[PDB]
C-alpha cells in the first residue's frame, strides 16, 4: 500500500504551474530530478514525453497517481495503451482548451471491450 504520496503531472505549462503552487509535485532534494514534466505544446518532440512517461511509471515508484493531458497522451498513444498497471494510476483528463474525448482516454477503451 503506502510507499507513494506524490502526484506526478504530464501537462501544459500553465496547468502544471498552478498544480505545483497548490502543492502536489516537487523537485526532489537528493535526486535533483523533477517529479513533474511541463510541456510546450507542439514545440516539444513526441520522444521527450515518452522518456518522461517511463520515468514516472517505472524509474520512479513514489508516484501514486499519474495525471496526463488528453492532447499530450494521444501523441504517445502506443506507450500509454501498453501501460495497464494500477501502480501508478493512469488518469487522463482534458487538456487546456480541449474537450472530453473518450478516445484520448486509455482506460475507457480497455474497459469497453471484454465487458
Amino acid at each position: 500500500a503506502e510507499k507513494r504520496t506524490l502526484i506526478a503531472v504530464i501537462a501544459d505549462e500553465d496547468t502544471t504551474t498552478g498544480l505545483l503552487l497548490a502543492g502536489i509535485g516537487q523537485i526532489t532534494p537528493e535526486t535533483q530530478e523533477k517529479n513533474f514534466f511541463v510541456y510546450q505544446e507542439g514545440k516539444t518532440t513526441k520522444e521527450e514525453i515518452t522518456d518522461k512517461f517511463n520515468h514516472f511509471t517505472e524509474e520512479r515508484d513514489d508516484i501514486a497517481i499519474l495525471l496526463i493531458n488528453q492532447h499530450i497522451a494521444e501523441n504517445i498513444r502506443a506507450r500509454v495503451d501498453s501501460f495497464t498497471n494500477a501502480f501508478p494510476a493512469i488518469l487522463e483528463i482534458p487538456s487546456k482548451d480541449h474537450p472530453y474525448d473518450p478516445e484520448k482516454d486509455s482506460v475507457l477503451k480497455r474497459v469497453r471491450k471484454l465487458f
Binding site: 500500500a1 503506502e2 510507499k3 507513494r4 504520496t5 506524490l6 502526484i7 501544459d12 505549462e13 500553465d14 496547468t15 502544471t16 504551474t17 498552478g18 498544480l19 505545483l20 503552487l21 497548490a22 502543492g23 502536489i24 509535485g25 516537487q26 523537485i27 532534494p29 523533477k34 513533474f36 511541463v38 501514486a64 497517481i65 495525471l67 495497464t84 498497471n85 494500477a86 501502480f87 494510476a89 493512469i90 488518469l91 487522463e92 483528463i93 482534458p94 487546456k96 482548451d97 474537450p99 472530453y100 473518450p102 482516454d105 482506460v107 475507457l108 480497455r110 474497459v111 471484454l114 465487458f115
Partner: protein, 210 residues
C-alpha cells in the same frame, strides 16, 4: 488410462468439486461485473467533471501569468519542494479481491510558498493559489476510484476465464472418464455369472444322469 476397479468413488468427488466451483465462481463473477457497471457510469462522469474544473483554474492562472509581465511558473518551480496534497493508501475489500483506495490529506504543517509581495503582480498570484488548492483537491478525491477501477477491470477478466474453463473442459472430462471405466466394470461382474452358469450346466447334466 486410469484405474478400472472402483475409481467411481474418487471420480464422483472430482465432479462435485468441479460443480461447486461453477456455481460459486459464477456468483462471484456476477457480483464483480454488477459492481463494475456501477463504477463505469461514475468514472465516465468524473472524467468530464475534472476536465471542466482543470480548464477553469488553468485559465485564471494563465490570465495572471500574462498580466504581471513575468512568468510566474519559473518562480513556482524553485519553490516547489514539498507537496501539500498527498494521499494515504488503503486496501479495501470489494468482494474477495483487494482494490487500491486512497484518502487525501492536506498538510497543515506546510506554510504558503513565497511568490507574493511582487507588488501589484503579487496580489494576482495570491488570489490564484486559493482557487487552485480547492480545484486540485477535486482531481485527487475523484482519482481514488480510477485506480480501483483498473484493477477491477483486470480481475474480472481473470474470473471470467475460470468459469468458462471449468464449465467446458473439466466437467465433461469427469463425465467421459467415469463412463469409460463404468462400461468395463459392469461387464466383469456380468460375465462371471455367465461363466458360473456355463460350468454349473455341465455339472447338472452329469449328476442328473446318475
Amino acid at each position: 488410462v486410469f484405474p478400472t476397479r472402483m475409481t467411481l468413488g474418487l471420480m464422483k468427488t472430482k465432479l462435485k468439486g468441479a460443480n461447486q466451483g461453477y456455481s460459486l465462481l459464477k456468483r462471484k463473477s456476477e457480483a464483480l461485473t454488477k459492481r463494475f457497471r456501477d463504477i463505469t457510469k461514475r468514472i465516465d462522469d468524473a472524467k468530464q467533471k475534472m476536465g471542466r474544473v482543470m480548464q477553469t483554474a488553468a485559465f485564471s492562472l494563465a490570465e495572471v501569468s500574462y498580466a504581471t509581465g513575468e512568468n510566474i511558473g519559473y518562480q513556482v518551480q524553485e519553490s516547489v519542494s514539498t507537496a501539500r496534497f498527498k494521499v494515504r493508501a488503503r486496501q479495501e475489500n470489494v468482494s474477495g479481491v483487494y482494490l487500491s483506495q486512497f484518502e487525501s490529506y492536506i498538510d497543515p504543517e506546510i506554510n504558503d510558498f513565497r511568490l507574493t509581495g511582487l507588488g501589484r503582480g503579487g496580489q494576482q498570484v495570491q488570489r490564484a493559489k486559493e482557487i487552485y488548492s480547492r480545484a486540485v483537491e477535486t482531481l485527487v478525491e475523484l482519482a481514488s476510484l480510477q485506480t480501483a477501477f483498473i484493477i477491477l477491470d483486470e480481475v474480472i477478466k481473470v474470473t471470467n476465464r475460470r468459469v468458462n474453463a471449468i464449465e467446458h473442459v473439466i466437467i465433461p472430462r469427469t463425465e467421459n472418464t467415469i463412463a469409460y471405466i463404468n462400461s468395463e466394470l459392469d461387464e466383469l461382474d456380468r460375465e462371471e455369472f455367465y461363466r458360473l452358469k456355463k460350468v454349473q450346466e455341465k455339472k447338472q447334466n452329469e449328476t442328473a444322469k446318475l
